[PDB]
Structure formats: C-alpha cells, structure tokens
Amino acid sequence: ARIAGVEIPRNKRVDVALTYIYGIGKARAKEALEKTGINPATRVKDLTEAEVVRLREYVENTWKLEGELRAEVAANIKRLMDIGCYRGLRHRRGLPVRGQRTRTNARTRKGPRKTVAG
Amino acid sequence: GKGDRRTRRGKIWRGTYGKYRPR
Amino acid sequence: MDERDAIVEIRAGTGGEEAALFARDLFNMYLRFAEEMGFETEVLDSHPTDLGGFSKVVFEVRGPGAYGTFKYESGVHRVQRVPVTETQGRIHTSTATVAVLPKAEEEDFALN
Amino acid sequence: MKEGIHPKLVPARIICGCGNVIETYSTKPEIYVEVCSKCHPFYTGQQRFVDTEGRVERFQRRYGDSYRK
Amino acid sequence: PRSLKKGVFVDDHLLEKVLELNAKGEKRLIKTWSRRSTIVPEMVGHTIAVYNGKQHVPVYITENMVGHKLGEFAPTRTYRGHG
Amino acid sequence: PLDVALKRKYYEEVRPELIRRFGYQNVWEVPRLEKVVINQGLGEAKEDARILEKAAQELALITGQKPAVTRAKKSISNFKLRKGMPIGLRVTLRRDRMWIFLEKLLNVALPRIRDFRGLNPNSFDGRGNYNLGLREQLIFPEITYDMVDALRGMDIAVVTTAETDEEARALLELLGFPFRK
RNA sequence: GGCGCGUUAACAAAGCGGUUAUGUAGCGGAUUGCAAAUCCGUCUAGUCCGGUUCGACUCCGGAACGCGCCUCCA
RNA sequence: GGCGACACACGUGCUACAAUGCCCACUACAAAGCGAUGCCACCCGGCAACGGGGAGCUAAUCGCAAAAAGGUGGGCCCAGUUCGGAUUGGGGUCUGCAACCCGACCCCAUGAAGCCGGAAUCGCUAGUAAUCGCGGAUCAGCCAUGCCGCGGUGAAUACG
RNA sequence: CGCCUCCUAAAAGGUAACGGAGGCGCCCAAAGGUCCCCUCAGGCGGGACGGAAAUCCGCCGGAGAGCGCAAGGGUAGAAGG
Ligand SMILES: [Mg+2]
Ligand SMILES: [Mg+2]
Ligand SMILES: [Mg+2]
Ligand SMILES: [Mg+2]
Ligand SMILES: [Mg+2]
Ligand SMILES: [Mg+2]
Ligand SMILES: [Mg+2]
Ligand SMILES: [Mg+2]
Ligand SMILES: [Mg+2]
Ligand SMILES: [Mg+2]
Ligand SMILES: [Mg+2]
Ligand SMILES: [Mg+2]
Ligand SMILES: [Mg+2]
Ligand SMILES: [Mg+2]
Ligand SMILES: [Mg+2]
Ligand SMILES: [Mg+2]
Ligand SMILES: [Mg+2]
Ligand SMILES: [Mg+2]
Ligand SMILES: [Mg+2]
Ligand SMILES: [Mg+2]
Ligand SMILES: [Mg+2]
Ligand SMILES: [Mg+2]
Ligand SMILES: [Mg+2]
Ligand SMILES: [Mg+2]
Ligand SMILES: [Mg+2]
Ligand SMILES: [Mg+2]
Ligand SMILES: [Mg+2]
Ligand SMILES: [Mg+2]
Ligand SMILES: [Mg+2]
Ligand SMILES: [Mg+2]
Ligand SMILES: [Mg+2]
Ligand SMILES: [Mg+2]
Ligand SMILES: [Mg+2]
Ligand SMILES: [Mg+2]
Ligand SMILES: [Mg+2]
Ligand SMILES: [Mg+2]
Ligand SMILES: [Mg+2]
Ligand SMILES: [Mg+2]
Ligand SMILES: [Mg+2]
Ligand SMILES: [Mg+2]
Ligand SMILES: [Mg+2]
Ligand SMILES: [Mg+2]
Ligand SMILES: [Mg+2]
Ligand SMILES: [Mg+2]
Ligand SMILES: [Mg+2]
Ligand SMILES: [Mg+2]
Ligand SMILES: [Mg+2]
Ligand SMILES: [Mg+2]
Ligand SMILES: [Mg+2]
Ligand SMILES: [Mg+2]
Ligand SMILES: [Mg+2]
Ligand SMILES: [Mg+2]
Ligand SMILES: [Mg+2]
Ligand SMILES: [Mg+2]
Ligand SMILES: [Mg+2]
Ligand SMILES: [Mg+2]
Ligand SMILES: [Mg+2]
Ligand SMILES: [Mg+2]
Ligand SMILES: [Mg+2]
Ligand SMILES: [Zn+2]
C-alpha cells in the first residue's frame, strides 16, 4: 500500500504508475508531477522518498481517491435510486442509464446472454 | 484506437476537436 | 358449468400442415385472451409440428368463470389466407376445430 | 519464553513520512511508515479532506433565481 | 444539459401556481403536463400530478431531488419483466 | 520489566482518569488489561498446504511471539475439513509483549487500514471485553508487500478486568482506540 | 400372504459414500427455398418416513407402488 | 406519451484484440463538393467543446482546410498493457419554446468484454482487394458506425 | 440355529413362546504399561474472510459430551483429551 493505499508498479514511469491508482488518469498523472517537479519519466525503482512522500502528500491531499471516490459515487447512484429518478430506476434493474437501445446490445450492463426458448 | 475520444485518432474519427486534438 | 374451470381441445381440421398452423394461431389467441381475463392456463396435452404448429393441443383455463366465456368458442373455425406452405400465392380455405368442455371431477370409486 | 523459537525483540524506531517518530519495540530496529496516529485524517480532529462539502447539492446551487416572481 | 448562459428552465405556468400557492396557503394537487420543467426549491412539499401520456402521477417533491425534471418521476413504460 | 510508552500512559494518564470517572475505592477495582489473544482463523491450510508456517513466520514478526496451532474439534463435510486438521494459529500476548503490540496497533497499524473510519463502538463483549477483526496483515509495520504472499486477516481479542462495557469503553478510548460511533 | 427384485430427469436406462452417466428427445445456432437427415453447442434427477455417517441417489430399517416366483397333502 | 421498451434470437455494420502496433511532438502530398438568418479567415477569453469580438466572399478571388495513412524524432517493452474504449459518476458547451423519457459534443474520474473467434459463411481478378482520410445531400441539432461520392498508399493468385 | 445388549422376568439368581427391539464373527503397535498435565456437550454475547456449524475471547453450564462399533451398566475425585 505505497501511495494512496495502493502500491504502484515499479520498473515503469511515474506518470504511468500513478494511473494505476483508482482516481487518476493521464491528466492527473501529468499534473501531480509537474505541480511537484518530479520527473514524469523516472523509473519507480529510482525515486528517493523525498519525491515519494512529496508526491504522495500532493496526491492524497489534492484529489478524492480510492475508497473516498468509490464510496462517494456509491452514494450517488444510491441517491438517484432512493428518490425514484429514472436513472435510479435503471440502476435498480441493472439496465442502461444513459438512454442506449436495449432491443439488442447492452451486454456490458446486462451481463452475459441469458438465451431463452422462442 | 479510433474509438478512444481521449486521443487524437478518436477526435479525427469523430471530426471534433479538444485537448487531445486542438485546432 | 359457467363457473367451473374449463378445458379447451384445439385440433387441426381440413388443411394439413396449415390447419395445424392455424390451430397454433387459435392456441395463442386463447392463452393471450386468458391473461386478459386473469384466468390461469396450463397445457395438458400438446402435439407440435416441425413447421411450428400443433396437430392437437389441450390446455385448461383455471379461473372462476372460465366455462362461462370460453364455451362460445366450441365449433369449427375457418381460415382463408395465402398459406406459408403455399408457393403459387393461392388462397387456401382451411379449418381448425375447438372443443370446450367443463373440467371433469376425479371422483373416487368404492363399493356400496 | 522458550529459546530458539521466538524472534528476539529489540528497541525499535518507527518513522512516519510526516516526520513523526515513535519509540517502541519490534523485530526490526527501524521501520518507516507512510501514515500514523499523528497525521491520520480520522485522528487529526476532523481534518476533513477535500470533502468539506455541504454537498453542496442541490438547492444550494442557487445558480439562477432570475426566473420571475 | 441546457446551456448555463440561459436561464434554468421552468415553464412558469407551473412555477406561477406553486408561488401563488405559497401565498394563499397551499398545498393541493397540481396536475401538469410539463415533465420538461426542472424542479425548484419553490415546489418542495407540493405534490404535482405529472402526466405520463396516459395518467397523472402524484409526485411529492423533496430536497434530494431539486436539480431533476418532474418527468423523471412519472415514468412512461410499465415493464414488470419477462417470463 | 521495560518501559513501553503506551504502558506509562496507562499508569500515568489512564488510571487516574478512570478513578475520576467511576470513583473506585480500591487500586485493583480499576480496569486493567488482562491479555490480547490474536487468532488467524486460516483454515485454507486444511489440505492446500502447511501455509501456516508462513503465517506463523509473520504473526511472529508482528508480535515477537511464536504462535501455536489450532486443530479442528470435529469434522465438517462442507468445510472440506476432517477433525484434527491444522486450521489456524493463535498467539496469547501478556504483559510487556501485550503492551508493545497494542502500542503499534493503535499508533501505526489501525491508521494503515484502508478507509479506516473508526473502530466499531458495539463490538464490546457485553462483559467488558473487546474484539476487532482485521482484513490483512500488511497493516502491521513489520510486514511488507515484498515478503508477503497472501492476504490473511485475523481476530483480535482484548480482555479486561472491567465488569461492564462502559468501564471497558473508557479504558480503551483513554488508551487510544479510535472509536467510530 | 410368503420370498426375491426395483422406484433416478421428457422417456428408456446405468455406475457410484464426496465427482455432467449414457442414448434419443427437448432448447440455441449452422446447413437447406422449407422440412427432415446431418453439423456445432446445450440442458431438466434420484418415491415417502426414520436412522448411520463429517457427508447418503448410493448403506441400514420401514411405508406406498410396480414386477417375478410360490400358495402344496388332504 | 410512444415510435427509442428488453428474459431473448437473426441480418447489416463500426471499434478492437496490438509492436508491420499504440502515443506525443514536429514535417509533407490529394480530389470532389459546399457556402449571404450562409462558409467563416484572423484575434482574444476558455485545458476544451465553445463564447466574445471580427476581416473576406453573392465566390478557380473569401472560407469550410486539418487531408489521413506518409515522413523525421523520441517514447512505450510484450503485460488485458501507453492494447482496447464499453460502462458508470461528476463538471460543462450548443441547438432548439423546450433535451426526463430521448440529442450531439467537451473535460476530469472510471478502463468492461475482448489474447484473432465452433459448425459454418461473405467479398474481391488491377489501380481491384486491403488500408487511409476528405465532401455532399437530408438537416435547428442529431443518435451517420448509414448512403451516394472523392482522391491518397496499393498487393496476392487464377494450374485448371 | 452359536455369541452379545435391553425388555418380557412377578425388586436375589434363574426362568419360556415362530414374544418385543437391536447388535457380533472385528479391531488397536496404540486404541497397550507407567508417570505427568488437562476437562465436556450445550446456551447467550463478542470477532476479517467465516456460514446453523471451521478457529479466537468472555460469561453461564455436574455432566445431558466423550469412551472405535449394539445396548446396558459404569465413568470428570476419569474409564474421557
Ligand atoms: Mg487510474
Ligand atoms: Mg446513445
Ligand atoms: Mg407447394
Ligand atoms: Mg483508588
Ligand atoms: Mg520481550
Ligand atoms: Mg453491543
Ligand atoms: Mg472483563
Ligand atoms: Mg507494514
Ligand atoms: Mg439407480
Ligand atoms: Mg424413468
Ligand atoms: Mg446401459
Ligand atoms: Mg452394480
Ligand atoms: Mg443427456
Ligand atoms: Mg436444434
Ligand atoms: Mg431448418
Ligand atoms: Mg443424512
Ligand atoms: Mg436420509
Ligand atoms: Mg450426494
Ligand atoms: Mg433414493
Ligand atoms: Mg430402503
Ligand atoms: Mg405331494
Ligand atoms: Mg420508426
Ligand atoms: Mg431506449
Ligand atoms: Mg449471434
Ligand atoms: Mg453500423
Ligand atoms: Mg455483427
Ligand atoms: Mg452542409
Ligand atoms: Mg483492464
Ligand atoms: Mg479476461
Ligand atoms: Mg487506449
Ligand atoms: Mg455524465
Ligand atoms: Mg432528448
Ligand atoms: Mg489502457
Ligand atoms: Mg498479445
Ligand atoms: Mg470479373
Ligand atoms: Mg487503422
Ligand atoms: Mg463521412
Ligand atoms: Mg447535419
Ligand atoms: Mg444346539
Ligand atoms: Mg459362537
Ligand atoms: Mg430378576
Ligand atoms: Mg431388570
Ligand atoms: Mg423375583
Ligand atoms: Mg406379589
Ligand atoms: Mg448362582
Ligand atoms: Mg425367548
Ligand atoms: Mg416346559
Ligand atoms: Mg433359553
Ligand atoms: Mg430386532
Ligand atoms: Mg441378525
Ligand atoms: Mg479401548
Ligand atoms: Mg484408553
Ligand atoms: Mg502414554
Ligand atoms: Mg460451545
Ligand atoms: Mg457466536
Ligand atoms: Mg461462529
Ligand atoms: Mg454416557
Ligand atoms: Mg465416534
Ligand atoms: Mg453401531
Ligand atoms: Zn504520520
């Protein structure tokens, strides 16, 4: 549990390894390194704890992450479901939420096919 | 790939612009 | 009578492969009618064709008032259409037969 | 305790990346941690992180009020 | 969403009712057809009968659902399931 | 009999606050820490391996005390378990070893818990003892990601001489147990 | 009545103290103008009651039902 | 309000599964079309979509314009990855009276399935197939990955 | 059809019926000798995975557990671990 509670891969670069935390893309990768002056191309195997504890201090303090982001979004859908919004409706039944078609695909959200008789 | 709107190729495919492909 | 559960025996009449197909139409017509009546349907005897229909189907209509309504469907039902088994685009007059019967008892037999 | 079977305990110094230092005893005489009691959010009072919310949702948008009376 | 530079949209023949109500001592049932209208804090407590194409759905309005439209809560397709 | 920072705090800081809070008349009436019993209810090591020997290696680096096996009282078909199998390790910590362990549990280990929002206020025995359960053993400082090879949690039992829950709740909180609710 | 054998899914029929029987059918797909045949896949189980055992479709005891055999001399 | 539904099933496609690839930066070479509540140069604010300005053109004149693979350089190092972009959360832009059902686009976060696909099955004989981007009609916007087009790079094999 | 346990069996022993119910034809190299140590089933509460039930803590719990296998007797002041 190195940074933000998640050990980040070594033998890789810092900007690509920061992505391996839930809550950081290429953007916040590029950001936290510039905004802390840490070479984005360093092997994680070659970082003194100065860069480490500085980078971690930025990353944990700046953005809502790992469990916080997961718990926050968990309340979000829950809230839509509670009130009875359409997006909450379609979160109860596990269907599309952003208005896709359902007659055919939706298999990412409706899981594997459940072939019936017909 | 041409589906990742978060890249230049994806912006080319959709013909739109943005950060990852600016004009 | 009118209040007891009913049994419907759909048989294919003159028409051959398409009589059985029309019988399949009358079959779906009564199962779907039954739902729009709250009546409960279960199959007791089915005899399908590979073309999709049945030479014979028997099914019950479990509902307080099934015989009162379904009893008007007994008789010969005539279809005139261009069958899916026809290849020269002709109109064929075919028949299916519907039998409507009150659900019998099962009364046990002992000697007096 | 039985000899030969137990890891000997030596006086240990445990350093957290916030500069906190804790004199304890351990199997290792020096361990470096990234969190501790002195700098943990739940510990440092509230130390409410980026979630100083108020939500603020949603009536606390107020983004408008222009619509007539 | 509707552009921020524009005004947060309410059909105003329905906001009028809620504020005229807030004066005279509400709250009765307000049958509307304006599903398209966003919900405003002026309607919390009220019960609006949002039509769904067939019928009028009473919807009580609470603070966890301000930014939403009134038609999200009067859905239009009765599903039940399959089988 | 050595000085442990949390041990001083019990005598110096905790004892008088407890007397002040409950009004005991005898020096032995005031709650005390009896023991901490740490059980890894493994049971994966039923027929899969003697994986215990690695968990004992790490449970010993965490507490300085070599644990001791626990064997199945009976056989259970569903658990794929026959009576007598090595299904867990238990280590009993007393005195200085008990103090040294909690001192690191409260200060550095409970903080390293992911998304730690306090200890459960209701996990009290009903009779003045407390039990918490952990999900993984890297929470403790002596265990790293390199020498680890599997996520094994545990159950921690802290036994006190307090007759009521309220007396025990005061003792732990005064020691440094961060209670959630 | 006695003695023997049995009850498994849609049907027929096996092994087994822990474990996809099998054939055909049924269900999804392919092929075909269509249907068969064929090809790729797939699926539903142990009569009831009580025991034994960590664990019973499997072993024990009994009940119901079915089958086979016997019921002779006075 | 529905035509947009979703236990399922088929057709037609797009995007992939990666290194002959992906990424970023810089540097090239088309054709055919469209355009006065229209095309929008250029400028500024905005990470951006865009917004505010603002020339020129009733158009071989002005604009849509970037063509893309291509080229140079650096990076990734064979992993569900700097492959893939589905899903969902949050924050925005625009059109239109109005974007709940049910719009498109932008940014941040999320990074699913997929490791080249069973029986089977389609296209194509040369500037063809493959690959690469560009324009139109319809049209407020757009669910276009569709259609009709347009050129760039450019094969294999045909005994019979 | 021999052997074991209970009942019938009429409070010593014994006691029959094609009376009511069950079991044996083994096993254990420790499941034997001795010394030393230990005490159950179950109920409630508490505890990551972990459930009715795996292991851990506490309280109550004299024996209702256990003792290879039938039943009976016996049995933790051990014959049980
Ligand atoms: Mg990430
Ligand atoms: Mg859509
Ligand atoms: Mg014909
Ligand atoms: Mg005192
Ligand atoms: Mg010691
Ligand atoms: Mg409690
Ligand atoms: Mg106590
Ligand atoms: Mg550690
Ligand atoms: Mg059998
Ligand atoms: Mg059978
Ligand atoms: Mg056989
Ligand atoms: Mg056999
Ligand atoms: Mg089979
Ligand atoms: Mg088939
Ligand atoms: Mg066919
Ligand atoms: Mg059983
Ligand atoms: Mg049984
Ligand atoms: Mg079984
Ligand atoms: Mg059985
Ligand atoms: Mg039996
Ligand atoms: Mg004779
Ligand atoms: Mg239509
Ligand atoms: Mg839809
Ligand atoms: Mg298919
Ligand atoms: Mg398509
Ligand atoms: Mg397809
Ligand atoms: Mg146009
Ligand atoms: Mg992945
Ligand atoms: Mg996978
Ligand atoms: Mg990608
Ligand atoms: Mg969104
Ligand atoms: Mg819409
Ligand atoms: Mg990726
Ligand atoms: Mg690969
Ligand atoms: Mg030709
Ligand atoms: Mg390509
Ligand atoms: Mg196009
Ligand atoms: Mg258009
Ligand atoms: Mg004899
Ligand atoms: Mg004998
Ligand atoms: Mg006697
Ligand atoms: Mg007696
Ligand atoms: Mg006597
Ligand atoms: Mg007498
Ligand atoms: Mg005698
Ligand atoms: Mg006798
Ligand atoms: Mg006699
Ligand atoms: Mg005798
Ligand atoms: Mg017997
Ligand atoms: Mg016998
Ligand atoms: Mg013995
Ligand atoms: Mg013995
Ligand atoms: Mg001995
Ligand atoms: Mg117990
Ligand atoms: Mg319990
Ligand atoms: Mg338990
Ligand atoms: Mg006993
Ligand atoms: Mg036993
Ligand atoms: Mg026995
Ligand atoms: Zn610290």
Curated annotation (Swiss-Prot), chain A:
Source organism per UniProt:
Thermus thermophilus (strain ATCC 27634 / DSM 579 / HB8)
**Superkingdom of the source species:** Bacteria
Task: Set out the biological process GO terms recorded for this chain's protein.
Answer: translation
Where is the organism placed in the taxonomic lineage, from the top? Bacteria, Thermotogati, Deinococcota, Deinococci, Thermales
- What's this protein's name? Small ribosomal subunit protein uS13
Which terms in the GO cellular component ontology are assigned? cytosol; small ribosomal subunit
The record's keywords, sorted A to Z, are: Ribonucleoprotein, Ribosomal protein, RNA-binding, rRNA-binding, tRNA-binding
Describe its assembly. Answer: Part of the 30S ribosomal subunit. Forms a loose heterodimer with protein S19. Forms two bridges to the 50S subunit in the 70S ribosome, contacting protein L5 and the 23S rRNA; these bridges are straddled by the 5S rRNA.
Primary role: Located at the top of the head of the 30S subunit, it contacts several helices of the 16S rRNA. In the 70S ribosome structure it contacts the 23S rRNA (bridge B1a) and protein L5 of the 50S subunit (bridge B1b), connecting the top of the two subunits; these bridges are in contact with the A site and P site tRNAs respectively and are implicated in movement during ribosome translocation. Separately contacts the tRNAs in the A and P sites.
From Swiss-Prot, chain B:
InterPro entries in the cross-refs = Ribosomal_bTHX (IPR031414), Ribosomal_bTHX/bTHXc/bTHXm (IPR030826)
Annotated Basic residues bias: 1-12
Q: Which UniProt keywords apply?
A: Ribonucleoprotein, Ribosomal protein, RNA-binding, rRNA-binding
Pfam families for this protein: Thx
Look up keyword Aminoacyl-tRNA synthetase and say if it applies.
no
Residue ranges for the region (Disordered) are 1-23
Q: Where is the signal peptide?
A: none
Q: Name one GO cellular component term.
A: ribonucleoprotein complex
* A GO term, aspect molecular function: rRNA binding
**Quaternary form?**
Part of the 30S ribosomal subunit.
User: What does the similarity note say?
Assistant: Belongs to the bacterial ribosomal protein bTHX family.
Q: What does this protein do?
A: Binds at the top of the head of the 30S subunit. It stabilizes a number of different RNA elements and thus is important for subunit structure.
Q: What protein name does the entry list?
A: Small ribosomal subunit protein bTHX
Q: Which organism is it from?
A: Thermus thermophilus (strain ATCC 27634 / DSM 579 / HB8)
Q: What is the lineage of its organism?
A: Bacteria, Thermotogati, Deinococcota, Deinococci, Thermales
Name of the gene:
rpsU
Swiss-Prot record, chain D:
Superkingdom as given in the UniProt entry: Bacteria
Q: Give the UniProt record's GO annotations in the biological process aspect.
A: translation
Q: Which PROSITE patterns match?
A: RIBOSOMAL_L31
Any Pfam family hit: Ribosomal_L31
Where does this protein hold Zn(2+)? 16, 18, 36, 39
Per its UniProt record, the required cofactor names are: Zn(2+)
Q: Which GO terms describe its cellular component?
A: ribonucleoprotein complex; ribosome
Q: What's noted on cofactor binding? A: Binds 1 zinc ion per subunit.
Record-level Gene Ontology MF annotations: metal ion binding; rRNA binding; structural constituent of ribosome
Keywords from the UniProt entry:
Metal-binding, Ribonucleoprotein, Ribosomal protein, RNA-binding, rRNA-binding, Zinc
Q: Which function does this protein serve? A: Binds the 23S rRNA.
Query: What family is this protein classified in?
Result: Belongs to the bacterial ribosomal protein bL31 family. Type A subfamily.
What PANTHER family does this protein's entry cite? 50S RIBOSOMAL PROTEIN L31, CHLOROPLASTIC (PTHR33280), LARGE RIBOSOMAL SUBUNIT PROTEIN BL31C (PTHR33280:SF1)
Q: How does it assemble?
A: Part of the 50S ribosomal subunit.
- Protein name according to UniProt: Large ribosomal subunit protein bL31
Query: What organism is the protein native to?
Result: Thermus thermophilus (strain ATCC 27634 / DSM 579 / HB8)
Q: What is the lineage of its organism?
A: Bacteria, Thermotogati, Deinococcota, Deinococci, Thermales
Question: Gene name, please?
Answer: rpmE
UniProtKB/Swiss-Prot annotation, chain E:
Q: Where are the transmembrane segments?
A: none
What processes in GO biological process is this protein linked to? Answer: ribosomal small subunit assembly; translation
Instruction: Give any Gene Ontology cellular component.
Output: small ribosomal subunit
Q: Which UniProt keywords apply?
A: Ribonucleoprotein, Ribosomal protein, RNA-binding, rRNA-binding
Specify the superkingdom. Bacteria
Q: Which InterPro entries match?
A: Ribosomal_uS19 (IPR002222), Ribosomal_uS19_bac-type (IPR005732), Ribosomal_uS19_CS (IPR020934), Ribosomal_uS19_SF (IPR023575)
Q: Which family does it belong to?
A: Belongs to the universal ribosomal protein uS19 family.
> Which HAMAP family does this UniProt record tie to the protein?
Ribosomal_uS19
Main function = Located at the top of the head of the 30S subunit, extending towards the 50S subunit, which it may contact in the 70S complex. Contacts several RNA helices of the 16S rRNA.
Q: Which NCBIfam families match?
A: rpsS_bact
Q: How does it assemble?
A: Part of the 30S ribosomal subunit. Forms a loose dimer with protein S13.
Q: Which PANTHER family match?
A: RIBOSOMAL PROTEIN S19P FAMILY MEMBER, SMALL RIBOSOMAL SUBUNIT PROTEIN US19M
This chain's protein is named Small ribosomal subunit protein uS19
Q: Which organism is it from?
A: Thermus thermophilus (strain ATCC 27634 / DSM 579 / HB8)
Provide the gene name from the record. rpsS
